[PDB]
Structures are given as structure tokens and as C-alpha cells.
Design a protein around this ligand. Sequence first.
Ligand SMILES: *[C@@H]1O[C@H](CO)[C@@H](O[C@@H]2O[C@H](CO)[C@@H](O[C@@H]3O[C@H](CO)[C@@H](O)[C@H](O[C@H]4O[C@H](CO)[C@@H](O)[C@H](O)[C@@H]4O)[C@@H]3O)[C@H](O)[C@H]2NC(C)=O)[C@H](O)[C@H]1NC(C)=O
Ligand SMILES: *[C@@H]1O[C@H](CO)[C@@H](O[C@@H]2O[C@H](CO)[C@@H](O[C@@H]3O[C@H](CO)[C@@H](O)[C@H](O[C@H]4O[C@H](CO)[C@@H](O)[C@H](O)[C@@H]4O)[C@@H]3O)[C@H](O)[C@H]2NC(C)=O)[C@H](O)[C@H]1NC(C)=O
Ligand code: 3BI
Ligand code: 3BI
Ligand SMILES: *[C@@H]1O[C@H](CO)[C@@H](O[C@@H]2O[C@H](CO)[C@@H](O)[C@H](O)[C@H]2NC(C)=O)[C@H](O)[C@H]1NC(C)=O
Ligand SMILES: *[C@@H]1O[C@H](CO)[C@@H](O[C@@H]2O[C@H](CO)[C@@H](O)[C@H](O)[C@H]2NC(C)=O)[C@H](O)[C@H]1NC(C)=O
Ligand SMILES: *[C@@H]1O[C@H](CO)[C@@H](O[C@@H]2O[C@H](CO)[C@@H](O)[C@H](O)[C@H]2NC(C)=O)[C@H](O)[C@H]1NC(C)=O
Ligand SMILES: *[C@@H]1O[C@H](CO)[C@@H](O[C@@H]2O[C@H](CO)[C@@H](O)[C@H](O)[C@H]2NC(C)=O)[C@H](O)[C@H]1NC(C)=O
Ligand code: NAG
Ligand code: NAG
Ligand code: NAG
Ligand code: NAG
Ligand code: NAG
Ligand code: NAG
Ligand code: NAG
Ligand code: NAG
Ligand code: CA
Ligand code: CA
Ligand code: CL
Ligand code: CL
Ligand code: ZN
Ligand code: ZN
Ligand code: ZN
Ligand code: ZN
Lengths: 694, 694
Amino acid sequence: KHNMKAFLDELKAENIKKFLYNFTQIPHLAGTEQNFQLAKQIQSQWKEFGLDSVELAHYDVLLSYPNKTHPNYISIINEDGNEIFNTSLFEPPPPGYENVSDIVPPFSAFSPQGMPEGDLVYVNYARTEDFFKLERDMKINCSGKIVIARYGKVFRGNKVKNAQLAGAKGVILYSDPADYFAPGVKSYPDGWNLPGGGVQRGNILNLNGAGDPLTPGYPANEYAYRRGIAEAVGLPSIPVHPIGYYDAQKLLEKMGGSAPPDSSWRGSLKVPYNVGPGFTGNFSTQKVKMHIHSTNEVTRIYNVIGTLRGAVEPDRYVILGGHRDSWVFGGIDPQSGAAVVHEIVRSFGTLKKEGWRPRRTILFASWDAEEFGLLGSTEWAEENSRLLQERGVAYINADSSIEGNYTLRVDCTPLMYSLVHNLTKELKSPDEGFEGKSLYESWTKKSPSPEFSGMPRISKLGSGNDFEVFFQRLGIASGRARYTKNWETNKFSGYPLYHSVYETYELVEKFYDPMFKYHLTVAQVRGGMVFELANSIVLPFDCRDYAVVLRKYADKIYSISMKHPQEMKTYSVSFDSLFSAVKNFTEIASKFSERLQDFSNPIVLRMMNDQLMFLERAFIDPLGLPDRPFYRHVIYAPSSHNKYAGESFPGIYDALFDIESKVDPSKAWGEVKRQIYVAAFTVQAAAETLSEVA
Amino acid sequence: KHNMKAFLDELKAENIKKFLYNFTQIPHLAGTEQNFQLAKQIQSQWKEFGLDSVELAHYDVLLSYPNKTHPNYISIINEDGNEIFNTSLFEPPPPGYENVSDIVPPFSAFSPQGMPEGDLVYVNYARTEDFFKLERDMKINCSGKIVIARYGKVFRGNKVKNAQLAGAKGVILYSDPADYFAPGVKSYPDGWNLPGGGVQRGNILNLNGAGDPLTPGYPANEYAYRRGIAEAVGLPSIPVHPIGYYDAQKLLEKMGGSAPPDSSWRGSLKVPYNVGPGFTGNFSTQKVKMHIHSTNEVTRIYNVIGTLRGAVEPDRYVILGGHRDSWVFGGIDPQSGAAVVHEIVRSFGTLKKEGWRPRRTILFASWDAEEFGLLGSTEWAEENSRLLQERGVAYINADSSIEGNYTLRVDCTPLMYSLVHNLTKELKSPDEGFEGKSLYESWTKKSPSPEFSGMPRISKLGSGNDFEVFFQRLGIASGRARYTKNWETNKFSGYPLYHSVYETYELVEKFYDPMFKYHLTVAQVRGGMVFELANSIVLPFDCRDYAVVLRKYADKIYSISMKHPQEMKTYSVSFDSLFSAVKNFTEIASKFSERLQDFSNPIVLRMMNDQLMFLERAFIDPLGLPDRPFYRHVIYAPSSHNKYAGESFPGIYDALFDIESKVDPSKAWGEVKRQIYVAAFTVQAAAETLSEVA
Ligand SMILES: *[C@@H]1O[C@H](CO)[C@@H](O[C@@H]2O[C@H](CO)[C@@H](O[C@@H]3O[C@H](CO)[C@@H](O)[C@H](O[C@H]4O[C@H](CO)[C@@H](O)[C@H](O)[C@@H]4O)[C@@H]3O)[C@H](O)[C@H]2NC(C)=O)[C@H](O)[C@H]1NC(C)=O
Ligand SMILES: *[C@@H]1O[C@H](CO)[C@@H](O[C@@H]2O[C@H](CO)[C@@H](O[C@@H]3O[C@H](CO)[C@@H](O)[C@H](O[C@H]4O[C@H](CO)[C@@H](O)[C@H](O)[C@@H]4O)[C@@H]3O)[C@H](O)[C@H]2NC(C)=O)[C@H](O)[C@H]1NC(C)=O
Ligand SMILES: CN(Cc1cnc2nc(N)nc(N)c2n1)c1ccc(C(=O)N[C@H](CCP(=O)(O)C[C@@H](CCC(=O)O)C(=O)O)C(=O)O)cc1
Ligand SMILES: CN(Cc1cnc2nc(N)nc(N)c2n1)c1ccc(C(=O)N[C@H](CCP(=O)(O)C[C@@H](CCC(=O)O)C(=O)O)C(=O)O)cc1
Ligand SMILES: *[C@@H]1O[C@H](CO)[C@@H](O[C@@H]2O[C@H](CO)[C@@H](O)[C@H](O)[C@H]2NC(C)=O)[C@H](O)[C@H]1NC(C)=O
Ligand SMILES: *[C@@H]1O[C@H](CO)[C@@H](O[C@@H]2O[C@H](CO)[C@@H](O)[C@H](O)[C@H]2NC(C)=O)[C@H](O)[C@H]1NC(C)=O
Ligand SMILES: *[C@@H]1O[C@H](CO)[C@@H](O[C@@H]2O[C@H](CO)[C@@H](O)[C@H](O)[C@H]2NC(C)=O)[C@H](O)[C@H]1NC(C)=O
Ligand SMILES: *[C@@H]1O[C@H](CO)[C@@H](O[C@@H]2O[C@H](CO)[C@@H](O)[C@H](O)[C@H]2NC(C)=O)[C@H](O)[C@H]1NC(C)=O
Ligand SMILES: *[C@@H]1O[C@H](CO)[C@@H](O)[C@H](O)[C@H]1NC(C)=O
Ligand SMILES: *[C@@H]1O[C@H](CO)[C@@H](O)[C@H](O)[C@H]1NC(C)=O
Ligand SMILES: *[C@@H]1O[C@H](CO)[C@@H](O)[C@H](O)[C@H]1NC(C)=O
Ligand SMILES: *[C@@H]1O[C@H](CO)[C@@H](O)[C@H](O)[C@H]1NC(C)=O
Ligand SMILES: *[C@@H]1O[C@H](CO)[C@@H](O)[C@H](O)[C@H]1NC(C)=O
Ligand SMILES: *[C@@H]1O[C@H](CO)[C@@H](O)[C@H](O)[C@H]1NC(C)=O
Ligand SMILES: *[C@@H]1O[C@H](CO)[C@@H](O)[C@H](O)[C@H]1NC(C)=O
Ligand SMILES: *[C@@H]1O[C@H](CO)[C@@H](O)[C@H](O)[C@H]1NC(C)=O
Ligand SMILES: [Ca+2]
Ligand SMILES: [Ca+2]
Ligand SMILES: [Cl-]
Ligand SMILES: [Cl-]
Ligand SMILES: [Zn+2]
Ligand SMILES: [Zn+2]
Ligand SMILES: [Zn+2]
Ligand SMILES: [Zn+2]
């Protein structure tokens, strides 16, 4: 029999281990020859595994690289202009890789060039609230200063945007041991912690969903018209560079000016964490000087796109996609995900070779240039947007499979909650102490829902991964899953070795998942979701789950506004239309669910499957959110303060944010009311897609 | 048998005559009680005729009305401020209507209030090229002048926009006998010509597809947030008023300054048609003074929406819609169309009562507030956009059925050309001299295609009617048909009595269509198109016809650019990508047509019907055209110079228009190249929707 169990049983931990090893022996930086060779390898193997077609889709997009003969570094310079301390030119390579070529040195991708010299101000995590504290409470002015900020809490491009708007003339990013060194564990190679010489690479763009900076809205194909650099989307205006904590300690130790406002501003280094500006008395004539010489360059990138044609509904697409490009070896990010996708393709191909095909078409994607701004997935979606919006059932992301070894992490649309609950009840838990129990049981025990008894936590989608175009721009139901750490007992950010030269195959095999049992569990979750989406007769979406969350988010946004009762009275700000729309959605979703259960008629079925598929699509507003035309989903958008976090009712949330500081309250509360109207109308319009069609 | 012939045979000229009489005894101005009563009458009758549901959909939109106790008029004032001549306060009512109440006096809807006094400049038809001639060739400056312009050639809102940008402080519109008095025919009531006291009402907005000025993008429902008047879309900034040719002759006869530049500037009045500014020597101290006191007011409007549910594909909608509101009696516009829709609803309802249902759902619409800017249709489409874009098969408009008695006029998407040709070959011609011949035969003989032998002319859709939202914003295949005049042997504009108090039931019954045989023919064309769209197993669209026209339009836009060969060399402006995309579309459309002919499988069928339905949709760009976000179709938009005319490849056309006058040619030709890229990409993307789906 060819059923889900046959698919799941064919998946093997040992294959995922072999593929991970194969994908992480050399760097696969986007735009380099090594990453093109790996694309061609994956294309050939997916064909051998049995897919119907496998093509490369290429684009020419703006990338950024250091200059090999003019390296980036930061100095402390004395009054005579002598550089008395320089930061490192590269990370010390890990054992057995000290002769590997083409390791890109640490840099912030898309930084402009410059050699700014000035006094330092320490800005904590450079979040919106850190800058409010400096400017409004401490009266510290960053204008014309170099800011130094610790990584953590928010996407690094938001930190750079915040520093730019504060008037900074450069930004230094660093990894503090408070956020990247777990107590009691050793530094790589003897444990999974970040050494003092490790550095986190990463792009610092603020693209808001645009894709390639030069071609917003349209694929970067051979005849594309490109914006000039000065009109490009999302590029920073001040130089930026990242460093490790040995180098940060030398820049921070001399800091003077004001004390940190409180303990939340202190990391773990043996320094005062003074905010500045500048250095204490003895050193007050010393300054900090950046030297950034990286260049932006249009460069060819390659996505691999595999098709397994559907037997019954070939014009319905279920997409499993994840990136292939890495900053260095990508032992976790992305190759622990790419190895899982490769084994999933192999397992589906084994069924196909025995004569099976799924009901709907499955598309498999190996995206390029994700690390430079989600460029490969977004360009491909721009090229194929008409196919995707009329035919796209769901997108399942497949970046890193593990970021810890504690429990499952799922982030997805409410439409997939029931699918995930039911699938995880049928899968075995890999956790010690839960032998013979379901994954649902271990996950629910370790990560309880804040809202419901005997349910697990499932988070909102934010951004910072390749589902962004599919979900926030095109309104295709999307989800992701991986193994993660215990977020309670840990104060560190993500995993410590993120985007460092130390993130290797050995890291994973020695410290995260020696038996590859967590990778296998994640392959079962991602592949099982794909299987059910592509094979279930009725699409496995439950509209009633969206009704429940919409009420939660309406309660939340109303609570924010109700901190301003006098203004709500003055400007007649009512949420009644939004609660009415959510009540209607709840009633109509309940009636649709009864029909779906009570309806031999393939046209009633497809009609009803189209109602299910287009429900996520109904939350799209073609005019987009304010000043973010490519964030079109009215219920969810990446937070304006942190691309990695999702925000609910984002148009209303941003209209309310810091509203007490706005100079024209009547204008500000009028925009709150406009966003309430847009949200209530969109929820009611989405509800009406589930009414009887005529 | 219940087939198309049964439907067509049930239609009766005598019923259309009775309905026309019933709809034209009193005015039905939008927003008035009489128009609401007629909406309720139509709702009740459509229910009696047999529709499954019939509802009113209401909205509160900005309308405009004169002030009943402070009338609008224009004066000539002498140096002492005495008003020595006043224009009329109303049109002399026609025989037997001299006691009818609630006839709105002539006014330009949405004019601001004002009493500007100044010197006149005559600007011919106030087209873009008329203002170029005045400013660039004659060196006449309109700044601070009142302009007087003759109706004709272009939409009156474009004339007002052009006068505003020339610096005018007011506009007087008038009907010249050259354009509204056919030689050899008598004035109403003794013939169909415009009397000297007749005046053309009409709105002067420049909405570019937005709908209600106060709520662009969103329906004007009970909780809508409205823009303030100062931020409203499309309102004119200078006062405007229309007059008849007896009053125009008094304003024009004293004109001095420069002579008309040539004969194309002279109408038929016994005046010199001097351009001004101001009056000849003896009268040079006299001025013209407008007095406009109309007010804009949010007012409730009502669409009637009837549903005949489909038997097999109830979630596929074929829409037959036309407006109900009129300026006065609406004897032609719109009631000659509304009477045809009413008889079509009656005939479908007769089949339904005998047990028949069409394959797909048919929606019937009686739109409100069309005369004030397409407001009813656009608000309803904004409310229902998600249903329409996923389910809308086609929209057939049904405004005026007749504007002459000579031959058929059809304007539609290329997707419907084959449908129209085949249907008209099966219909009887009503024309004298073609007894026993098909409508196709008389139409082709009287209105030959410029391109093809033995084919009839079918024009592009422009705007200025209720299909605009469906076609240009949402990308739903649309078409319209009516009986029209001989455009060769006539120098007049549209029909002479347009938007005057004289456009009555008697006009139609005495002079246009005494036997109602042209109305019956138009009912057969519109109802037959609806029938075939709602009942054919395979949707009756031929993608190959789009391929043919795309080549014609690419040749045309290339020819425009090739007037500037030096700039095309300097800036490397190539149309190669656009011709490549059109070649690919032609090849892929041919292969799709073979599959459609070569494919018992209802899923292959619907898959292929969805490919046909979403083909028009594929030409939509979600980012819209430059500065016109609600014109989203890349192949067709209303002309930027004349809303009534369609323009092909509008983004490229507007980038090329008057390009030799642009101050920065590199920037201007860069925008030409960007628009070529957008057009080539959209054509290729639309082609790829017709490729095999996996
Ligand atoms: C949730 O679903 C319900 C339907 O179950 C839907 O109810 C609709 O609410 C609107 C109000 O937003 C109602 O609109 C009224 O319609 C009647 C005619 O049917 C009008 O006469 C009303 O206008 C009068 O009253 C107003 C309020 O005092 C005045 O402002 C106005 O000037 C008029 O005097 C009003 O337009 C509508 O009837 C119901 N439809 C029903 C019950 O079927 C509700 O809107 C949905 N929620 C959302 C957010 O869409
Ligand atoms: C019409 O349909 C055809 C397919 O039948 C489609 O053809 C495609 O054209 C593009 C060009 O726009 C081709 O792209 C090439 O792809 C190859 C790899 O397959 C690349 O190596 C090429 O790049 C090299 O050459 C360029 C030109 O000199 C250089 O600028 C570049 O730096 C590289 O040196 C280039 O990208 C593509 O292969 C074909 N696909 C086929 C034939 O299947 C055509 O684009 C369609 N028209 C439109 C408007 O879409
Ligand atoms: C800050 N929060 C929440 C958080 C983090 N750490 C914590 N610790 C404790 N102890 N406790 C906590 N409550 C906590 N909370 C985040 C941050 C990041 C992630 C995330 O998962 N990120 C990656 C990133 C994958 P990438 O590297 O390939 C994408 C790339 C480009 C992105 C782009 O350009 O758009 C980039 O980010 O540089 C992914 O999505 O897989 C999700 C949540
Ligand atoms: C100027 N060209 C071409 C033309 C006209 N007359 C000619 N004579 C000779 N002899 N020769 C010629 N070549 C010629 N050519 C036009 C102008 C108008 C039409 C048109 O058909 N118009 C109505 C208008 C219906 P409406 O009144 O209900 C819409 C309303 C609101 C519109 C809005 O706000 O968007 C308004 O226009 O005021 C319709 O579409 O049914 C189509 C072509
Ligand atoms: C990763 O695995 C691939 C696939 O097995 C290896 O590529 C093959 O290498 C052999 C020996 O060089 C060739 O004969 C095959 O043509 C290759 N197959 C391909 C490219 O599909 C590759 O060597 C492995 N890489 C590493 C680093 O182990
Ligand atoms: C998750 O599993 C539940 C429990 O089996 C499914 O809910 C049942 O669905 C069947 C089949 O339609 C109904 O007859 C039952 O009454 C449902 N039981 C309930 C609601 O407890 C549910 O549909 C599954 N969710 C999916 C497939 O998305
Ligand atoms: C237009 O026709 C309608 C429908 O026949 C007429 O309205 C009917 O009038 C009679 C007599 O007043 C009433 O008893 C019916 O209730 C009406 N039916 C409706 C409204 O559906 C109407 O009188 C006619 N109008 C004109 C001007 O002839
Ligand atoms: C218009 O009528 C023509 C002539 O009947 C139709 O074209 C024929 O379609 C049949 C049925 O598929 C084919 O077998 C013939 O070979 C076609 N003949 C041709 C192209 O001359 C055409 O499809 C009709 N158009 C519609 C319904 O939109
Ligand atoms: C890199 O630096 C070298 C050495 O100074 C220089 O010659 C070259 O221009 C730079 N390359 C760039 C800017 O791409
Ligand atoms: C830092 O590098 C600069 C540039 O090469 C050099 O002049 C300086 O001597 C270095 N300083 C130290 C302390 O190594
Ligand atoms: C910050 O510093 C600069 C002085 O160089 C000044 O332009 C800016 O207005 C200051 N902002 C304050 C004090 O808020
Ligand atoms: C794996 O789990 C063990 C046991 O809880 C823990 O002590 C160890 O730190 C974990 N490894 C990683 C990399 O999280
Ligand atoms: C109409 O004019 C009258 C008479 O002067 C005036 O009282 C009233 O304000 C006007 N109505 C309006 C502006 O709606
Ligand atoms: C024009 O109307 C104004 C306003 O009522 C009046 O003062 C004037 O006498 C009228 N002029 C003529 C010539 O009728
Ligand atoms: C038109 O007239 C006004 C003078 O009042 C002036 O402001 C404007 O620049 C003139 N334009 C010309 C002469 O082009
Ligand atoms: C109707 O047709 C006749 C015969 O061609 C023509 O002379 C007459 O003017 C037409 N009526 C109208 C209103 O066009
Ligand atoms: Ca792009
Ligand atoms: Ca609106
Ligand atoms: Cl992921
Ligand atoms: Cl029409
Ligand atoms: Zn990643
Ligand atoms: Zn990464
Ligand atoms: Zn009309
Ligand atoms: Zn009209």
C-alpha cells in the first residue's frame, strides 16, 4: 500500500546524515561557483530520485562581497592618527579546516563603503525602545557618533535602520557572551558555544518584502530594467561591520560618559557598559575608525525547481522549499534543512517509481541567495505570481531542521493547526523519557499552549525566511517546523554559532544530533504535512481555527487602544466593526464546516477545496500596508521593529504604536480608525468567501 | 428543448417597448427618492420573473447637486458690475413635460462653488493638442482666464483637467451645432437634433477608476472611513458650467484677440471663433462672471443584484450589468439598455420556471450612480473583489441599446471576438435591405474591419461605463454591444440629445426605433453572449485572438518609438523582449488550443476552463499603472487624454507621449525602457498561464 505510512517509513536518519556531510565540506556562498556546482548536483540527483522535471531558474540580483585585497576592519586611533588596536581580519578556522579556501571573512552584507572616525555610543540591542531610552530619558544624542550594539532580540537590519534614523554615522555589531555563550558549556570545538574570535555574518537590508533591491515587483531576468543604486530598495546609508567579543571588549572597556541606565543594558563582559559618548578621561582623545570596502555587484543566482505532477489535480501546487546558500559551511543553516528536503524528495521518488503519484502537484525548491534577503524565492515568486496565486495550495518551508534538541517548534497559519495536531499524534517522539509516546505528547508537555489545556504552542509566522513572499505577499497558506531549545531555561539568542565559520557538520554530529533522530522527526513533520496537503481529498485546512485566533487578535489590539481612553472618546474610535466582522467570520466558518462534513460530487468538492485554498488569499489587500506595498496580508505582517517577529493586525498596531508622541493627535487617531475599517472590511470579505457561492 | 434558440425566441420587442415607457416617465437621478422607488420596483419584478434571490446593495457615496434656491448661471458683466446678459436657468421642457417636477437644471456635477470674473479664452475642444497649440504655437496664456470649450471628441473631465493645468480659473462647456446638429434634421420635438436651449449635463471628475471619491479601494459601507474633501480623489479645483448654443453664441460673438489658427477650430455658429483673450475693442471692459453654488453631499445609492444559480458550476459567475440612474428621463441613456436587461431577465426566468438552469451562475445588476463616476458598480466590485477575481468569468455591459439605427457596434476583449462572430452569424439582421440575411452579414458590410476581409470592426474597450472596474481593475473578460450611427457620413458627436431634458421615450419611439427591432437585436446579442458564457461546456474564449492583437499593438507602439531613432540608439531602447514575449504567447496559445480541442474528464475540462478564465486576469499588474493604481491591466487602459478611448500598451504609450518635450531625456527614455520590460514580462507571464500546468 502507498499511503502516508509508506512515505514516512522510507525516510532514514542515515541518509539525512550522509546528505548533510555531502553539503557542508566547502562553503556555498550565494553567487559563487561552488554554490552553482551544488545546484547542478541537486538538480541531477532529484532527477535520479524520480521527479518528472527538474530545472534551474536563474536571476541576476544585487549581492555584496568584501574586497579580497582591501580588507574590512575597525581601529581605535590615537590623536596622531595611529591605529593602536585593530579588529581581526578573519575568524580562526576550526580544526581540520585551517586550509579550506574561499571562507568569506566576517562582514555585514550591503554595507556602503566608508572610513568614518568618531566617538562611540553603546545602544544595547539597538531596538526602538533602546533608542527611545537614550534619546528621551537619558538625553544622549547619537548624531554623528559611531554606535556599538549587541546582536540579539531583533533582526540586525532593524538595528541598522534604527541607528541611521538616530543620526549615527556607522554601526558596529558584536556578539555578547550574555546572548551567545550558554553557562556551563565549552566553546567550539569542545562544545557548542561561540568563541571570543567567532563572528556572526548577515545582511543588513530593510527590503520589506521587495526581493532583489534593483527590480521590486518584477523578476530579475535577462531583460529586466534595473533601478540605479541610488533608487534601490533597502540599502543602508552608513557603514556597518560585525565583530566577536574579544574585539568588542577592547572597544567597550574604555567607554565613558553616562552609566548604563539599568541591568537590562549590561552584558557579561568585564566592562562597565557605559553608554558614552566616547572614552573615559585618559583616552578621551582616542576615536574609533571603521574601514569598510565591500562592494555591491549584480550576480547570477540559481534556484532548483523540481516537479512531481499530480494525478488528479495537477493544477494545484503544494510547495516544499528551503535555501541552499550559506554564509560559510552552513552545517545548521541551511544544510540541516536541505538534507531533510533531499531525503523527502528521495522518499516521494521511491513511491513514484512504484507507480504512485500524489493527488496534487508537488513542487520542490532549493532557493539561492536567501542569506542576502530572500532573493531567490522572491524573484521566482515574482516571475510565477499568476500561477501561484490561482493554483498555490500551501508552502512548507525547510530551513534549519535543528536549533536545539529539546522539543518541536512550529510556526504556521491557523489553517494548518489541526493538520499539525493530527499529524504529530501519529508520529513517534524522539525525546528521552517519551519512548513509546507520540510527538504530540512530548511537544505539548514541553511547550504548552499559553491559551489551552493539553494543546501545544504554535507561533505566528514572521519573516526572515523564504515563506515571506508566499505568505505575506501572495496569501498562500504557509508553515514551518524544526527542533528547538528550551526557551525558558536559556538566556541566549537562537543558537550560539549562527553564521560563524564554526557552524560545521561536526557541530551537528557531535553536539546537536549524533543519531540524526531529531532530523528524522523534522523530516516526518515536514514531509507528512506535504503528503497530507498534496493527497487528502478535502484540503486539510480548518477555517474555524482562524475564527478563534481572529478573536484573540481583536481582543489584543483593542486592549492596546484602551490604554488611551480619553482619545478614544474624543475621536470616537470604535472597534465595534472589527468585532462584528470577527463574529460574522465565526458564524460563517461554522456553517461552512458543517457543509464540508455534510456535502460523490467532485465539483462540490473542488468548489469547496477552492473555498479552502482561497481563504488565506482573501486576507490580502492589493494596496498593501502603509509604505510597505509588498506586505499585503491584513492579519499578519513582519513587525516594523523586528522582521523576525510576526505582528497581528499590523496596520492597526503600527497606527497605535507610540501614538502619544505624535504631534497631531486628530490625524493620528484618524489613521487608527482608517486601519480599523480596513481590518473589519477584510475580515468580513474573507468570511464571505466561505458563504454559499450563489 | 431549452437551448439558446428557446431563450432568444422568448425575447419580444413589445416587452422592451413597454419597459422603456415604464422607466422614462419621471427623472431617476441618483440619490433621489424616485430612483430608490425604481430600484425597489426592479427588485420586485426580477423576483416575480423567477430569479433565485434579488437584493439591494446600498452605499453612501459623494454626489453633487445644484442648490434649488441659489441657481447656477453665467453673466457678461459691464465695467460697473451690472450683469447685462445671463445664461438660462433651465432647459425649456419638451411638449407634455412642462409640468414634470424634479428635473435637475443643467450643471456640471462636482464643480466647486465660486464666482470667478474674467476674460474668456476659446480653447476648441480643450484637448491636450488644443492646449499645446495655444501655448506652444500661438503663445496664448490661459492663466487666470475663464476658458470656453466645445463639447465633443473627449470626455469632459479630461477637458477640465487640461484647463486646470493651463491655469484657467473657470470652464464653460457648450454644445456647438457643428458637433450636435446633423444637417437636414429638425430640432426636438420635430426631429432628433439638439435645440439652441438644450444643454448636456455630466460629471467632470478625474477618478482614474477609484469609484466614490471619499473611499478609494474600499466599499462605502456603513462603517467606512472617509477622506476629507481636501484629500478626495478626482475633484476639480475650478468652477465649471455647461450651456447651450443660443447662450454660447452670446458669449462668443464679442470675442477678440487672435484669430482661430485654422478651420478645425471653427464650429457652425455665426461667430469668428477668435481665441481671445477677452472681447473686441468696444467691449474690452466687459468680463464674464460665473456663479456656481452646487454642493457635494454624501448620499445613499442602491444597486439591484439578481442571482440565477448555476446547475453545475455555481461558483462561476457571468455578469450582465447596466445602470439605472439617469440625468433626467434617460430615454436612451440608460433606460434603452435597462429595458433590454429587464426583458433578458424575464426570458431567462421563463426557462427557469420550466425547470432549466444555466451551467454557471448568472448575476444581473442594475447599477446606481453611474452618471456620477461609475460609483455603484465600483463600490460593489470593491466589496466583492475576492469573489469576483476568483470566480468571475465575464462581464457584459448593458447601457444604451441604441445611439443610431445604422449598424451594430461591439467593443470587447479579444477573448470574445470568436463568440461574437459566431453568435451574430446565427441572428437575423433587422436592417432594411438585409431581410433574410444574418446580422454578421449586415454588420460586416456596413462596418468592415480595417485589418481583415469579410470581418467586422470590433473596438477596444475604453472607459466611461460600468465595465471599467471589472475589466481594467480586476481583469475579468468584458464586452458590450449596441446599435449605432454611420460614423463615416456624420460629423456630430455621439447622439445630439445626450444628457438633455429632450432625451425621452418619445425621442426613441418616434425617431430612433419605432418598431423596437434594433432594441430586440441588441437584446439578442447581449442575452446570447450571456447565454453562451453561462452554458457552454468549454468557455467560449479563443486565446489565439489575443495573440493576433498583441502583435498589432506591439507593431503600433514600436512605430511610435521609431519616430525617435537617434534617442533609441543613444539610450539602447529595444523592443526585442516585447516581440519575443508576443511570439511566445502566439506559440503557447496555439498549443493550448490544440489541447482544448484534443482533450470525458471534468477536471481536465475545469482545469482548462480555469486557464481560459484566468487568462484575462494574467494581464493585471498588482502595482497598477504609473500614478493610476486602479488601472491595472497592462494591455488596455483608458487613454490619459480621453477616458472614453482605450489605449493599448498604455504604460509604454504614456512614457513616449510628447517625449521630445521632456527636459531630461535620459530619465524619460529610461522610463520607456522600464515600461517595455513590464509589458514584455506581463505578456510572457500571461502566456505561461496557458502552458501545461505541471
Ligand atoms: C455582520 O453581518 C451582519 C449580517 O448578519 C451585517 O449586518 C448588516 O449591518 C449593516 C450595518 O453595518 C446593516 O445596514 C443597515 O441596513 C439597513 C437596510 O437594510 C439601513 O436602513 C441602515 O441604515 C440606517 O441606519 C443607520 C444606522 O443608524 C444610519 O446610519 C443610516 O443613515 C440609516 O438610517 C443600515 O445601512 C445591514 O442591514 C445588516 N444586514 C443584515 C442584518 O442582513 C454586518 O454589517 C456584518 N458586519 C460587518 C463588519 O460587515
Ligand atoms: C520566449 O521563450 C523562450 C523559450 O523558448 C525564452 O528563451 C529564454 O531566453 C533567455 C534570454 O532572455 C535565455 O537565457 C539564457 O539562459 C542561458 C542558460 O540557459 C544563459 O546562459 C544565458 O546567459 C548568458 O548569455 C547572456 C546573453 O548574451 C549574457 O547576458 C549572460 O551574461 C550569460 O552569458 C541567458 O540567461 C534562456 O535560455 C531561454 N530559455 C530557453 C531557450 O528555453 C525567452 O526568454 C522568452 N521570451 C520572453 C520575453 O520571456
Ligand atoms: C529574536 N526572535 C526570537 C528569539 C530568539 N532567541 C531567543 N532566545 C531565548 N533564550 N529566549 C527567547 N524568547 C528567544 N527569542 C527570533 C529570531 C530569529 C528567528 C529565526 O528562526 N531566524 C532564522 C533566520 C534564518 P536565516 O539566517 O537563513 C535568514 C537571513 C536573511 C533574512 C532576511 O534578509 O530577511 C538572516 O536572518 O540573516 C530562521 O528563520 O530560520 C526566530 C525568532
Ligand atoms: C469620442 N469617442 C468617439 C466618438 C464619438 N462621436 C463620434 N462622432 C463621429 N461622427 N465620428 C466619430 N469618429 C466619433 N467618435 C467616444 C465618446 C463616447 C463614447 C460613449 O459611448 N460614451 C457613453 C457614455 C455613457 P454615460 O453617459 O452613462 C457615462 C458617464 C460617466 C462616465 C464616467 O464618469 O466615467 C458620462 O460619460 O458622462 C457610453 O459609453 O455608453 C464612445 C466613444
Ligand atoms: C556529494 O555527492 C555527490 C553525489 O554523489 C558527489 O558527486 C559525484 O561525484 C562522483 C565522483 O567525483 C562523480 O563521478 C559523480 O558524477 C558526481 N555526481 C553528481 C555530481 O551528481 C560529490 O562528490 C559529493 N561531494 C562531497 C563533498 O562529498
Ligand atoms: C483531525 O482529526 C480529527 C479527529 O479525527 C478530525 O475531525 C473529525 O473529522 C471527521 C471526518 O470528517 C468527522 O466526522 C469528526 O466528527 C471530526 N471529529 C472531531 C472534530 O473531533 C479532523 O478533521 C482532522 N483535521 C484535519 C484533517 O485537518
Ligand atoms: C411601472 O410598472 C410597475 C410594475 O407594473 C408599476 O408599479 C405597479 O403599480 C401598481 C399600480 O400602482 C401597483 O398595484 C403595483 O404594486 C406596482 N408594482 C410594483 C411596484 O412592482 C408602475 O406603476 C409603472 N410605472 C409607470 C410610470 O407606469
Ligand atoms: C466559432 O465557430 C467555429 C466554427 O464552428 C468554431 O470552430 C470550430 O470548433 C470545432 C469544435 O471544437 C472544431 O472541431 C472546428 O475545427 C473549429 N473550426 C474552425 C476553427 O474553423 C469555434 O470554436 C467557435 N468559437 C467559439 C465557440 O468561441
Ligand atoms: C579592491 O581593492 C583593490 C586594492 O586596493 C583595488 O585595486 C580594487 O579597486 C578593489 N576592488 C573593488 C573595488 O571591487
Ligand atoms: C592596524 O592596521 C593598520 C593598517 O595596516 C596599521 O597601520 C597598524 O600598525 C595596525 N595597528 C596595530 C596595533 O596592529
Ligand atoms: C543632535 O546633535 C546634532 C548636533 O551636531 C544636532 O544637529 C541635533 O539637532 C541634536 N539633536 C538633539 C539635541 O535632540
Ligand atoms: C542536548 O540535550 C542535553 C540534555 O538536555 C543538553 O544538556 C545539551 O545541552 C543539548 N545540546 C544542545 C546543543 O542543545
Ligand atoms: C442654498 O442656497 C440657500 C439660499 O441662499 C441657502 O440658504 C443655503 O445655505 C444653500 N444650501 C446649501 C449650501 O446647501
Ligand atoms: C441677470 O441676473 C442678475 C441676478 O438676478 C440680475 O441682477 C440682472 O438684472 C440679470 N440681467 C439680465 C440682463 O437679465
Ligand atoms: C502666464 O501668465 C501668468 C501671469 O499672470 C504667469 O504667472 C505665467 O508664468 C505665464 N506663463 C507663460 C507666459 O508661459
Ligand atoms: C434612421 O435611419 C434613416 C434611414 O437611413 C435615417 O435617414 C435617419 O436619420 C435615422 N434615424 C436616426 C435617429 O439616426
Ligand atoms: Ca525583483
Ligand atoms: Ca470605495
Ligand atoms: Cl524553516
Ligand atoms: Cl453598453
Ligand atoms: Zn537559513
Ligand atoms: Zn542564515
Ligand atoms: Zn449611461
Ligand atoms: Zn450618461
